[PDB]
Amino acid sequence: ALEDSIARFQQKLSDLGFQIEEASWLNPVPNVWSVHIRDKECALCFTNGKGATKKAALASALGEYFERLSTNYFFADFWLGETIANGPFVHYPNEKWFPLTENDDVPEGLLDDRLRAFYDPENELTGSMLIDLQSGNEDRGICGLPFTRQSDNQTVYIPMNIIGNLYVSNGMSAGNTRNEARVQGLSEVFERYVKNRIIAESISLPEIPADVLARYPAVVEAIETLEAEGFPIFAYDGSLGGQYPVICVVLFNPANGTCFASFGAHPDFGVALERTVTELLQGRGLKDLDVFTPPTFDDEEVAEHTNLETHFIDSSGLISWDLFKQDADYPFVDWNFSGTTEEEFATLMAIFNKEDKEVYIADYEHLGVYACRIIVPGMSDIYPAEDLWLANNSMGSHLRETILSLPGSEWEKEDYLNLIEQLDEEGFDDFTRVRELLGLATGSDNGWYTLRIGELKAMLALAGGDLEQALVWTEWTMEFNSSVFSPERANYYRCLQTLLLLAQEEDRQPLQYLNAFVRMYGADAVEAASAAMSGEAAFYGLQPVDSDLHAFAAHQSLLKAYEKLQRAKAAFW
Amino acid sequence: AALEDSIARFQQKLSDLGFQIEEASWLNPVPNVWSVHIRDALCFTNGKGATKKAALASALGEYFERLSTNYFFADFWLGETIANGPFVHYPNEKWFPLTENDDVPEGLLDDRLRAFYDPENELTGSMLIDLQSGNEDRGICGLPFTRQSDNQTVYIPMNIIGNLYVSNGMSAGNTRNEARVQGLSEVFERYVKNRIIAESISLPEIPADVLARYPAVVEAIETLEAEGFPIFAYDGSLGGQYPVICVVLFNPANGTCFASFGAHPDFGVALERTVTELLQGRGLKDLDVFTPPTFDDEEVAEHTNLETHFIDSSGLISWDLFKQDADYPFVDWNFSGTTEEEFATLMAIFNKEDKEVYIADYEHLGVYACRIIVPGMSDIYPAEDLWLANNSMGSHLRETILSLPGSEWEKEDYLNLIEQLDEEGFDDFTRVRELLGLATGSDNGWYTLRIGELKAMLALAGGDLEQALVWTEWTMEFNSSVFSPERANYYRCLQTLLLLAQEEDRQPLQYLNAFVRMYGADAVEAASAAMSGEAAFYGLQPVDSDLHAFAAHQSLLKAYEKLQRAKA
Numbered sequence A: 001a002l003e004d005s006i007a008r009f010q011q012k013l014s015d016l017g018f019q020i021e022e023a024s025w026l027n028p029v030p031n032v033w034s035v036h037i038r039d040k041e042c043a044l045c046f047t048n049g050k051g052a053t054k055k056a057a058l059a060s061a062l063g064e065y066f067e068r069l070s071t072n073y074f075f076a077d078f079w080l081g082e083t084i085a086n087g088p089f090v091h092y093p094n095e096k097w098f099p100l101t102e103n104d105d106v107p108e109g110l111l112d113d114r115l116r117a118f119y120d121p122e123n124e125l126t127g128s129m130l131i132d133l134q135s136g137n138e139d140r141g142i143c144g145l146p147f148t149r150q151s152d153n154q155t156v157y158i159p160m161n162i163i164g165n166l167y168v169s170n171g172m173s174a175g176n177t178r179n180e181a182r183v184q185g186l187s188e189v190f191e192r193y194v195k196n197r198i199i200a201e202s203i204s205l206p207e208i209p210a211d212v213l214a215r216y217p218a219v220v221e222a223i224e225t226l227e228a229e230g231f232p233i234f235a236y237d238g239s240l241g242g243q244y245p246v247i248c249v250v251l252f253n254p255a256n257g258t259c260f261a262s263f264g265a266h267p268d269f270g271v272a273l274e275r276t277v278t279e280l281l282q283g284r285g286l287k288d289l290d291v292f293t294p295p296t297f298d299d300e301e302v303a304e305h306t307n308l309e310t311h312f313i314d315s316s317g318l319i320s321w322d323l324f325k326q327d328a329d330y331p332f333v334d335w336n337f338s339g340t341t342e343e344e345f346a347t348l349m350a351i352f353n354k355e356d357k358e359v360y361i362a363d364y365e366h367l368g369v370y371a372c373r374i375i376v377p378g379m380s381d382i383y384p385a386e387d388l389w390l391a392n393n394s395m396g397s398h399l400r401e402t403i404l405s406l407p408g409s410e411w412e413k414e415d416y417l418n419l420i421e422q423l424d425e426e427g428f429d430d431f432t433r434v435r436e437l438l439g440l441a442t443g444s445d446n447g448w449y450t451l452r453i454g455e456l457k458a459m460l461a462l463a464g465g466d467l468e469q470a471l472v473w474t475e476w477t478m479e480f481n482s483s484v485f486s487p488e489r490a491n492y493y494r495c496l497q498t499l500l501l502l503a504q505e506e507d508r509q510p511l512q513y514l515n516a517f518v519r520m521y522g523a524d525a526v527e528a529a530s531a532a533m534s535g536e537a538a539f540y541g542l543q544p545v546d547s548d549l550h551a552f553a554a555h556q557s558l559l560k561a562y563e564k565l566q567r568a569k570a571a572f573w
Numbered sequence B: 001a002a003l004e005d006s007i008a009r010f011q012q013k014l015s016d017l018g019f020q021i022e023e024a025s026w027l028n029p030v031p032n033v034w035s036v037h038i039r040d041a042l043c044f045t046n047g048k049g050a051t052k053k054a055a056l057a058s059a060l061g062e063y064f065e066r067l068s069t070n071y072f073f074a075d076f077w078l079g080e081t082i083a084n085g086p087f088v089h090y091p092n093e094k095w096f097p098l099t100e101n102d103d104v105p106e107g108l109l110d111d112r113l114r115a116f117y118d119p120e121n122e123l124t125g126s127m128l129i130d131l132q133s134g135n136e137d138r139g140i141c142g143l144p145f146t147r148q149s150d151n152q153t154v155y156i157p158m159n160i161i162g163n164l165y166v167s168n169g170m171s172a173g174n175t176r177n178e179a180r181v182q183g184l185s186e187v188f189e190r191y192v193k194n195r196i197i198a199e200s201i202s203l204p205e206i207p208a209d210v211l212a213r214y215p216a217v218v219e220a221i222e223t224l225e226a227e228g229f230p231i232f233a234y235d236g237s238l239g240g241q242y243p244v245i246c247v248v249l250f251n252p253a254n255g256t257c258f259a260s261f262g263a264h265p266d267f268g269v270a271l272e273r274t275v276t277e278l279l280q281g282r283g284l285k286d287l288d289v290f291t292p293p294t295f296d297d298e299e300v301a302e303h304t305n306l307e308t309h310f311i312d313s314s315g316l317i318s319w320d321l322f323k324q325d326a327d328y329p330f331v332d333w334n335f336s337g338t339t340e341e342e343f344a345t346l347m348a349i350f351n352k353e354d355k356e357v358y359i360a361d362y363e364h365l366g367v368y369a370c371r372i373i374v375p376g377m378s379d380i381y382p383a384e385d386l387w388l389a390n391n392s393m394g395s396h397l398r399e400t401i402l403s404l405p406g407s408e409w410e411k412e413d414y415l416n417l418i419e420q421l422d423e424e425g426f427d428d429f430t431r432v433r434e435l436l437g438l439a440t441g442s443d444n445g446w447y448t449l450r451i452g453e454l455k456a457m458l459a460l461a462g463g464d465l466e467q468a469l470v471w472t473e474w475t476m477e478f479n480s481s482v483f484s485p486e487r488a489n490y491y492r493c494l495q496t497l498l499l500l501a502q503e504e505d506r507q508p509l510q511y512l513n514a515f516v517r518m519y520g521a522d523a524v525e526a527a528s529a530a531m532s533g534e535a536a537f538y539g540l541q542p543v544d545s546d547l548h549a550f551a552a553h554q555s556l557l558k559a560y561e562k563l564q565r566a567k568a
């Protein structure tokens, strides 16, 4: 059966043009496996899997692969270029574009009353904020994705922009049947929602009694081995008195005084438990358990939304000491929500119903595996709605063309300095990587890979002939990036910094030092740095970039992959 | 002397003293550049030269140099027994007991030195107690030096020597004058070094036709260049005044520079010694720990930058050193001759500078060695350090502190001690072993004990947990790095418990089992015992007046005893 699911996933992938390879494999303790898998064409296009056996792990990873392919999630941080942005469809043939209105209100056919209120309580939200990153196509309008509201059965259109910023990869799954995927999606919503409550409210949870654990000897053996290897484990029921199908497992690493909390959910208690333990060690051997944090008594810090966001991103957030209290805030419950997938779905939906929460579900068949994306506003959100104002991944796209065209530019000095001011008016953090802000797959072998806003200001100051500013930002750049620069790029900045420092020396004659600089930095770096100081060529190591990004090999590879999916969408619809 | 003969003569005299010396590590990083490292096991020196044999003779020379001056022992208190024995440093020495108004006793120094070290006349005898004895009752131990102008014996406090001159102006050799010439050369090396650096002087390059008189050095230099390391070779004579060379290396990988200074009456020998010191102790992969040049001349000139330069040559250098135009013309200088001639030539320089020279000679290990002092030139630390950074300050409290482990005093006593440490102005980061002069070894808490951590222990023993938390946080912040895993785990546990004690709405028993799982039972037991005041001095064994408690220190005193033997 498993050997057959695997084979069947692998065949459907080949048939889509995807050649996948197992990269790294781990069996750190008995009954715990993880595997990493990627595109041969494309190493950044990967998933991971976990399980009680080698085969289970691989099936997990291929499952996740279809989950991420079906939701376009590999591509969610990137702009897909001018051609795709004007093609027949961008995300799905299904999608609906709502062009902007004169007073820039959110167009009439998007969302529903509940959602408008949830995302926009102050009624201060505008349509131009909602342009999806992938297209950036303001003229074409707001791309909305169809979801099915479960209370009735109505299709609701939700801006991709809102999905991408607030829900990220949460509530997504693949499965063998439509409902099976739905159940996993819903389970995951509960996993992350309950996780956040446990953490943010500093809840002391009830231990799973040893007689319950002993129904699951494979997990027990995994646990005991971890203990035996120097890692105390706490196994907790996270149901909050039987409300939710959630387990929590925590690991201590006494070597450095830290803890690491893993949360899993499934209608079957045993399976939830196994999943929680297998996720704990996913991607990690026993030498990789040293990057976590000590518990804390500062509950206010534990509760901060950013701490929860961190926990979602890498599980390296703060946990309260209270989670480990002798006495629990809830009795243990030997819960169970299992049944047929149809039963399971209804059981989980009933929970959402008693909570008075609407569920929105999109289903995808088009790669020949069932997959869903589920949104439960007030429960499935990873980032709070104000992020549509403060941390929108689309903000930054009006400037893309300007910035992509700085290499080779030749504007008047004033223009470049105004751009520094624009970047400050628009509020960009000096540490923001420019590639993330604009959605570019750069590759590692150019200056764009490591270009943050602060460095960009330095280049702009150089091109605009303001050397007081250029020095400020060049220092900033050296302080916060020499680490990651190639040796050639770091040498260039070291040279440049020295030259900018020298230019502020009112009692010193530059020609006295030129020979010494050539010996320290080499002639090319000196030539290049001096050219940058003249404003001649400030955009050191930045090649110019077209609208379809032919300049970046990485980004071309990304789009070759994406085209395979655009193909499969066209067939299916 | 011939090298084979110096080596032989040295190795024999060492065995005869009871010293088994072992060539440890050897380097020949480029042609005609050798260094060697030499051990008993923390009793060590290094040597440098153009050949393997030269390096070894250098190292053994240095070994006798350091043995004869007691320099291996300079940072350490030698215990109550030695401090009350017949003599501490040398049978020669003279003890000057303190006076009622606590003036500096009459028979020490001379008028010129009193005035130099104590211009304000603000100096007291109790400041001048040597670190090795700490014996205030016995008085100020003074060492006899010979004033060269008229040959009079002058007694100089060991305290002043140890704090201001450290290892500068010391050498050994085959003849008396050979040692003296190297000593005097060294005084010029370090004095001129400091001027070049502190005044941001641009020096004149040595022309290639002069370098070519010395093909061995040239080949060394060209290899370094070829390996990616630009070299500047400078005349440091300051227009032919001083017999000094400067060689600077760039590491373009890093953007850093490393400046080496050598001195000898023979230009060729000074040049070789400078290049050979540059790479001493270092292969070509070890040239990455230095500093970029700078335009901040005020920083370059700071005495602490010069002190750093003396300690590890990792100080700041001005970009000006590398200016196209030099502040002095190159001079093809030369002061060489017979040893006897060389000594006189160097002495004449000091005479034209109106500087007195004081020299102590030591024959007692069968090798000629000297220590030379030229106030105003050989000083490494400025005279005000006798007030501000005296290595004896901290010795009145030694007994107290050594007896804290196991102590059962009043809570009040311990807390007053925190106040004392603050009144006396000790830096929280001062390692206690340095402050008291203890060779601890690495496997105990004393190795890593800084004043801040000590305050933590004192607060714990005195039952002040608000303070104990403060200092325990401080300790974790500035030391978890170097602690053994066991010691770091203890502090992590303790910190957690102190934090818990500040929690007004939490019940400690709720967390105990979890703490035991994280920290282990011993650490929990221990940390709780420390919190009760029961046993605050975690991992600190108690220490007797002769330091039998520290194996390291016992080894140090076994070595010292060999020298004390040789002194009679």
Ligand SMILES: [Hg+2]
Pocket: A041, A042, A043, A044, A554, A557, A558
């Ligand atoms: Hg790629």
Ligand SMILES: [Hg+2]
Pocket: A042, A043, A044, A045, A046, A074, A558, A561
């Ligand atoms: Hg990819």
Ligand SMILES: [Hg+2]
Pocket: B041, B042, B043, B044, B072, B555, B556, B559
């Ligand atoms: Hg020693």
Ligand SMILES: [Hg+2]
Pocket: B041, B042, B043, B552, B555, B556
């Ligand atoms: Hg030793």
